[PDB]
């Protein structure tokens, strides 16, 4: 019966882990592509 949204958000960010080192460059690629394509 947890009342503390500290738990809620540490849990629900707990959904998502760390994505790195090409996703860094691959979001970048999709977005520079979107930029150059606008």
């Amino acid at each position: 019966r947890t009342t503390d949204p500290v738990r809620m958000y540490m849990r629900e960010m707990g959904t998502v882990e760390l994505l790195t080192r090409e996703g860094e460059i691959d979001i970048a690629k999709r977005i520079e592509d979107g930029i150059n394509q606008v």
Partner: protein
């Protein structure tokens, strides 16, 4: 200013639109140098209002040249600065949210309405799951929850054809969707289908909610909120100290966090983020919100650096530091002061010492007006520095003014009304108020460090109120009971006892005088003994004629003192009255009878002079306590030696091992108690009459002249046990465990304690001391509860024209009279014409006052029962007549209407209690005997024995009024019959106190039928004798084969036919439960009256009593008459097959037959006949009986409780609070209003007094009357404001708000809190002026 009534309501959004001046912006306050408000924040002058005279923040617009100008640099405006406190700003919301009180308290009000539970709604609004707004496809349902993932299934399944969402918006949409009408009619309808109890209740609940919203017009969508008010600064200030170091509220940060989080929210809504953070922010939002509304309700409470939690708004309204109790009902006051308190012995009744500088300070503007009137101090500054000079005229004038300017007087605790008084001033050369001493009584005060305080009758109305009401002449009998409260306490009574006294010893015996004056010549010349019986003449008076004195003189051989003491007598009285040494009780009856007979002032003046002569003579009388007054008797040592030898013998026995330890405990403790008693006899006989003094004779003794004994005999101080403490061994000691110690004390205070003995005293000492500290809170708590019920009541009327009430009979049982029926009547008024045992001699025309002429006139008569127009039988709408009450005690006359009855009732009742937590039957004397509602039998011995347990025996005197009344068991064995005459000192009754007899009033052979060894029974055959029967086992122990077969030994004639209950056709054999074991064998005969079988084996109490606390073990009653049998066989509990004479059988209920039964499975009762044992429920009594039974019950109960402590209060005090515990009766039928609901028995009695009247014969609805526990009854009340003031305010707020409640300011609380006058007593007249003005428009 003036207004009629008040009205609650929801705050509509457009209402804040209607209240508002400006939406708010950034939250900052000032420039760290320029300590001046910033704008559109918290202390913005622009919208709440201006700080100084006609200035913008920069100072561009001023002087009224720029009258209406708002300053375009700063948007700052030009006005006066008061509207700060009447205005309120507001704040618009980026989102909607819901209000919490409409959620979290019990019944939700919102999901309650919706038939959706709470946690459902939580899980929506914590934003963790969606929920169907609307089943577009009814494939899905409105009020249907859809998880974050199941939602997706439905989503990619369908898409368009649903609304299923999350957050306040969805709820807005839904509540905004739903109709009130159709649900309401359909609820009313399908109630008819199955109005099952919980179901129907719930139906009613929602129906009410529906039609409430209909008729109030209040809206559910306004439950949700998108604009929020704002408070002005000075209720939440920010203020400095010397260091430029400030102080702030608990609150300002709440708004600060709230506004900042809104800023963050809107800021992030500009930016199109994921909704995850949106959620997180808004959860912080609602957190801040409902924590503002209530910090420490929902989550881990919120603190500052303090680590103390932060005060909610709600907290400020709440508890004792809530407004109501802190600063609205009790209040600091101007024009008052206080002092240490000393005596004024020489004073008069009206007088009070007064340190003059106190009045000086207090009577300032009087004398300033007086000096502008004289013009010595023409102006006022001159008045000040002239005051400062100390001119004698200052004091001359002050004495001039203080004349006839009455004053108030306050000690705390002002527990009852007399804990403050009002006297006339008199001035003194000191800083120590004097007072008239005798009234320590009402204050319970003493000159040991106590304090008092004062208040001022400024207005003449108060001046005159004081002089007529709290002038001490007014109030000298308690209103609770009829005794004087100015009993002369300790020294006066003793010097009196000294004077009015009859030695034989001193001198001057057997001479003659003309009158007391020359005896004074002797005694003040110092020639005669004063406590010395001698002949002299007197001339007394009597108003034997029609209030006309009757003069005559004659002789008495009287003490010289008594002769002198006659001199003060005021001219009505005998000398027989003054013919004794005048116990303190005597003085009481003296002052009593004087006031009774003459009027007030003679008794007053008499009293003063008595105090004066007491001072004189007790100063003369000679008085000291010492070491030789302390005498121990001699025959004490060897008694203790006897005790030692005996306990040594019992020691040898316990060593031997025959006697046990607890036996020995009782043995030893009883014999030590006997030793203490013997010592008491010794010391008392060796002190009270130890004095042998001879007069003209060999030897003779009289009452002792020792100081200690006369202190005991006057009742001034001391008591036989206390003298035992100093002199004798004082009893024994209980350790803090509650045990009682085996070795009591040996020595005394005169000799000196032991180490251990005093170490032992410690225990019970500290016990009683912590009790001293810690029984009082109960009293005050109790007290304010009691009065919280009962303020509303004031006398409405003079005669209510009503009909009879309860009957009055004395309470003499167990011993002798414990309230004379004389004393019961006193001041009451009959229910009806009432006659004499000389019959048909009526004296009331249905009602008179019953004063001591009548009381004694009928004490002559042997009448012993009367009825009275009762407190409760009165029928006035909104109060009562005066008749149904009768007489004002403390006045001593029938009340004239218009005064609070509740308040004095509780002061009567709870004031005293603070101190007050701290076989056979045998006739004594001869007289008639009465046993009624009796079925019994001449037993086989030839005497009566009960078959109707209802019976109890009485000792009736030869006249007919009862001497004694005592219970008697079912079938107990007597030595006598009813209505006979028998000598005192005789054991008529006998029974084994363990047997419950099984007497047979039939006579007939007995045979072992229905019953078989081991099956329904056991067969136990007595190893002792040889004669036995079939032996019935208990509920459990018989083998279950015949435990479903009620065993019954059977009575028959010669033919084997069941001997009927003679005179009735009911057969007569006994279904035997356990322990009813029979002594005879098969074929054997019982006779009439013959046992087949024999069946062997505090204060918070009152808190439970008036609270209507209902016990755990009912001694339950017969719901209805007719025959009865037992029910289903113990799935947890057995049941009870009711069988009426002519009504319906089926009603049964659970029975624990682990607790004994009284009736048996073939036995008949009448309705309201007890069935089980233990305590019972009054609720059942009222449910079954009328009013008088239970009424009488508890009044007798608790009067006996307090009368244990010897405490005397009249009944009506009790009778009146009851009717306030009945402000409601629950309905039976319907047609007027809804079916059952607990509705005002008053308004019930109105509607029947209109609707069942020629309006109809009946559309309406019968009822049953309802009890309420006092603390709940109070709450369960029309008015809410009173209900908001003491307990559980918040929910009361909500419950009023929902419905458009509107108070009308009738109650005492109601009209006090508004600053209006009382609607009663003084302002009765003005209020009824207002009444017939509203009547007159």
């Amino acid at each position: 200013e003036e207004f009629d009534a008040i009205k609650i309501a929801l705050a509509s959004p457009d209402m804040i639109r209607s209240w508002s001046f400006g939406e708010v912006k950034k939250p900052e306050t000032i420039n760290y140098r320029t300590f001046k408000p910033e704008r559109d924040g918290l202390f913005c002058a622009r919208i709440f209002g201006p700080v100084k005279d006609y200035e913008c923040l920069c100072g561009k617009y001023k002087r009224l040249k720029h009258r209406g100008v708002i300053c375009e640099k700063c948007g700052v405006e030009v006005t006066q600065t008061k509207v700060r406190r009447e205005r309120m700003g507001h704040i618009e919301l980026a989102s909607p949210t819901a209000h919490i009180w409409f959620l979290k308290s019990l019944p939700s009000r919102i999901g309650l309405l919706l038939d959706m539970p709470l946690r459902d709604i939580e899980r929506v609004l914590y934003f963790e799951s969606y929920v169907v707004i609307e089943g577009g496809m009814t494939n899905l349902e409105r009020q249907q929850i859809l998880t974050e993932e199941q939602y997706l299934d439905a989503l990619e399944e369908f898409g368009d054809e649903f609304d299923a969402k999350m957050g306040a918006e969805a709820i807005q949409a839904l509540l905004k969707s739903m109709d009130l009408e159709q649900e309401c009619e359909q609820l009313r309808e399908e109630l008819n289908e199955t109005n099952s109890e919980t179901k129907r209740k719930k139906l009613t609940k929602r129906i009410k909610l529906l039609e409430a919203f209909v008729q109030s017009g209040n809206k559910p969508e306004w439950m949700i909120l998108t604009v929020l008010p704002v408070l002005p600064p000075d209720l939440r200030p920010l203020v400095p100290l010397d260091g430029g170091r400030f102080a702030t509220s608990d609150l300002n940060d709440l708004y600060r966090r709230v506004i900042n989080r809104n800023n963050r929210l809107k800021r992030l809504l500009d930016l199109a983020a994921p909704d995850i953070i949106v959620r997180n922010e808004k959860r912080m939002l609602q957190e801040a919100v409902d924590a503002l509304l209530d910090n420490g309700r929902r989550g881990r409470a919120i603190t500052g650096s303090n680590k103390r939690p932060l005060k909610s708004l709600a907290d400020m309204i709440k508890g004792k530091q809530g407004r109501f109790r802190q600063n609205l009902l009790g209040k600091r006051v101007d024009y008052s002061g206080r002092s240490v308190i000393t005596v004024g012995p020489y004073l008069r009744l009206h007088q009070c010492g007064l340190p003059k500088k106190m009045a000086l300070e207090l009577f300032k503007p009087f004398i300033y007006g007086k000096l502008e009137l004289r013009g010595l101090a023409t102006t006022i500054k001159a008045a000040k520095k002239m005051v400062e000079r100390e001119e004698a005229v200052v004091w001359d004038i002050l004495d001039e003014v203080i004349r006839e300017h009455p004053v108030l007087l306050n000690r705390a605790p002002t527990l009852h009304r007399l804990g403050i008084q009002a006297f006339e001033p008199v001035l003194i050369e000191g800083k120590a108020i004097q007072l008239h001493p005798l009234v320590c009584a009402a204050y319970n005060a003493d000159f040991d460090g106590d304090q008092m305080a004062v208040h001022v009758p400024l207005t003449l109305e108060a001046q005159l109120e004081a002089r007529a009401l709290m002038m001490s002449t007014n109030n000298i009998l308690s209103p609770a009971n009829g005794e004087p409260i100015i009993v002369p306490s300790q020294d006066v009574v003793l010097g009196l006892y000294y004077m009015t006294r009859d030695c034989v010893n001193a001198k001057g015996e057997g001479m003659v005088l003309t009158g007391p004056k020359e005896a004074e010549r002797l005694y003040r010349s110092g020639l005669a003994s004063l406590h010395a019986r001698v002949k002299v003449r007197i001339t007394e008076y009597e108003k034997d004629a029609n209030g006309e004195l009757v003069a005559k003189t004659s002789l008495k051989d009287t003490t010289v003192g008594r002769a002198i003491l006659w001199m003060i007598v005021p001219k009505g009285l005998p000398y027989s009255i003054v013919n004794q040494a005048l116990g303190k009780k005597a003085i009481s009856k003296m002052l009593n009878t004087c006031y009774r007979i003459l009027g007030l002032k003679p008794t007053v003046i008499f009293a003063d002079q008595i105090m004066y002569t007491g001072f004189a003579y007790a100063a003369r009388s000679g008085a000291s306590v010492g070491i030789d007054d302390m005498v121990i008797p001699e025959k004490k040592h060897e008694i203790i030696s006897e005790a030692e030898a005996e306990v040594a013998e019992i020691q040898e026995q316990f060593q031997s091992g025959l006697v046990t330890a607890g036996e020995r405990y009782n043995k030893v403790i009883d014999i030590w108690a006997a030793a203490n008693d013997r010592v008491s006899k010794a010391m008392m006989d060796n002190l009270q009459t130890e004095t042998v003094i001879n007069r003209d004779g060999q030897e003779e003794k009289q009452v002792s002249f020792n100081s200690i004994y006369m202190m005991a005999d006057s009742g001034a101080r001391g008591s036989a046990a206390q003298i035992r403490q100093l002199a004798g061994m004082r009893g024994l000691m209980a350790k803090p465990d509650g045990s009682i110690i085996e070795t009591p004390i040996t020595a005394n205070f005169r000799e000196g304690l032991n180490v251990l003995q005093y170490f032992i005293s410690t225990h019970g000492a500290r016990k009683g001391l912590a009790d001293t500290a810690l029984k009082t809170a109960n009293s005050g708590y109790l007290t304010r509860r009691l009065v919280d019920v009962a303020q509303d009541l004031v006398v409405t009327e003079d005669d209510c024209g009503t009909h009879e009430g309860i009957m009055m009979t004395p309470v003499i049982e167990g011993g002798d009279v414990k309230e004379p029926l004389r004393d019961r009547v006193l001041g009451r008024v009959t229910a009806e014409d009432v006659l004499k045992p000389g019959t048909a001699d009526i004296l009331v025309p249905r009602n008179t006052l019953l004063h001591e002429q009548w009381c004694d006139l009928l004490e002559e008569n042997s009448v012993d029962a009367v009825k009275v127009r009762s407190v409760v039988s009165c029928d006035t709408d909104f109060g009562v007549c005066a008749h149904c009450y009768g007489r004002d005690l403390a006045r001593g006359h029938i009340i004239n209407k218009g005064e609070a009855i509740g308040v004095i009732a509780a002061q009567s009742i709870g004031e005293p209690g603070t101190q007050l937590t701290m076989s056979s039957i045998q006739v004594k004397n001869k007289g008639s005997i009465k046993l009624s509602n009796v079925k019994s039998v001449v037993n086989s011995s030839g005497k009566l024995v009960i078959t109707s347990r209802n019976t109890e025996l009485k000792l009736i005197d030869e006249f007919g009024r009862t001497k004694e009344s005592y219970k008697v068991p079912y079938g107990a064995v007597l030595a006598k019959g009813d209505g006979e005459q028998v000598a005192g000192g005789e054991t008529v009754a006998n029974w084994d106190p363990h047997t419950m007899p099984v007497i047979t009033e039939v006579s007939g052979f007995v045979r072992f039928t229905d019953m078989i060894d081991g099956q329904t029974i056991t067969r136990q055959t007595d190893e002792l004798t040889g004669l036995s029967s079939l032996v019935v086992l208990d509920s459990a122990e018989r083998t279950a084969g015949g435990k479903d077969l009620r065993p019954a030994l059977k009575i028959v004639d010669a033919q084997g036919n069941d001997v009927l209950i003679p005179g009735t056709d009911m057969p007569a054999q006994y279904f035997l439960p356990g322990k009813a074991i029979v002594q005879l064998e098969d074929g054997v005969q019982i006779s009439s009256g013959d046992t087949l079988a024999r069946i062997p084996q505090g204060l918070p109490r009152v808190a439970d009593l008036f609270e209507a606390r209902r016990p755990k073990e009912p001694a339950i009653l017969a719901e209805i008459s007719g025959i009865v049998s037992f029910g289903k066989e113990t799935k947890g509990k057995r049941r009870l097959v009711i069988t009426p004479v002519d009504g319906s059988d089926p009603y049964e209920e659970m029975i624990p037959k682990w607790r004994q039964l009284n009736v048996f499975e073939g036995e008949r009762v009448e309705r309201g006949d007890v069935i089980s044992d233990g305590p019972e429920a009054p609720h059942d009594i009222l449910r079954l009986r009328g009013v008088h039974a239970v009424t009488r019950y508890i009044v007798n109960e608790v009067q006996d409780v307090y009368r244990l402590q010897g405490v005397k209060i009249n009944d009506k005090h009790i009778e009146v609070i009851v009717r306030q515990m009945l402000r409601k009766a629950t309905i039976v039928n319907a047609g007027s209003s809804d079916f059952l609901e607990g509705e005002q028995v008053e308004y019930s009695r109105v509607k029947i007094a209109n609707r069942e009247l020629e309006a109809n014969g009946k559309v309406g609805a019968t009822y049953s009357r309802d009890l309420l526990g006092i603390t709940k009854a109070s709450l369960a009340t029309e008015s809410f404001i009173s209900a908001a003031s003491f307990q559980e305010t918040t929910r009361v707020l909500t419950e009023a708000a929902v419905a458009g409640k509107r108070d009308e300011l009738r109650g005492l609380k109601e009209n006090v809190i508004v600053g209006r006058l009382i609607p009663a007593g003084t302002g009765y007249a003005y209020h009824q002026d207002r009444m017939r003005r509203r009547a007159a428009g």
